[PDB]
Amino acid sequence: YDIQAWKKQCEELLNLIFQCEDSEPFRQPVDLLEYPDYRDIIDTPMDFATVRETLEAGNYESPMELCKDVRLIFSNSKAYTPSKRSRIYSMSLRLSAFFEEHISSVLSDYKSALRFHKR
Ligand SMILES: Cc1cccc(C(=O)O)c1N
């Protein structure tokens, strides 16, 4: 029932994501010089270094907020991809499955801790 435990759990999950080869296209903001039409398609860029920095700055109040930004990295990849068979999009799908498999317990534990606090 530790209400703060999600933060280190998210830090550790981001460390695993950064070690995953599938995260490399998503570690830093998409290069606008390499993809000059990116901002014509994508309204809100997001990347894992921005997520980690937001977490480390104490600018997430809950793991749900972190999860919304990570999901935005994946929806941006799906929206920008020219093909559902593209290399970078395929990497995003695998990374998303890995993230969802690991974030589930973080969210469950946090929500349970909050319910216990308000019991
Ligand atoms: C950022 C991004 C997401 C999804 C697909 C691509 C691609 O160039 O195929 C891409 N550059």
Curated annotation (Swiss-Prot):
Annotated tissue distribution: Expressed in myeloma and epidermoid carcinoma cell lines.
Residues shown, of full length: 1316 to 1434 of 1821
Protein name, per record: PH-interacting protein
Occurrences of domain Bromo (ranges): 1-106
Subunit structure: Interacts with IRS1 and IRS2. Interacts (via bromo domain) with acetylated lysine residues on histone H1.4, histone H3 and H4 (in vitro).
Function, as annotated: Probable regulator of the insulin and insulin-like growth factor signaling pathways. Stimulates cell proliferation through regulation of cyclin transcription and has an anti-apoptotic activity through AKT1 phosphorylation and activation. Plays a role in the regulation of cell morphology and cytoskeletal organization.
Modification Phosphoserine, positions: 90
Phosphothreonine modifications at: 44
Subcellular location: Nucleus
Top-rank lineage group of the source organism: Eukaryota
Pathological association: Chung-Jansen syndrome: An autosomal dominant disorder characterized by developmental delay, intellectual disability, autistic features, anxiety, hypotonia, obesity, and dysmorphic features.
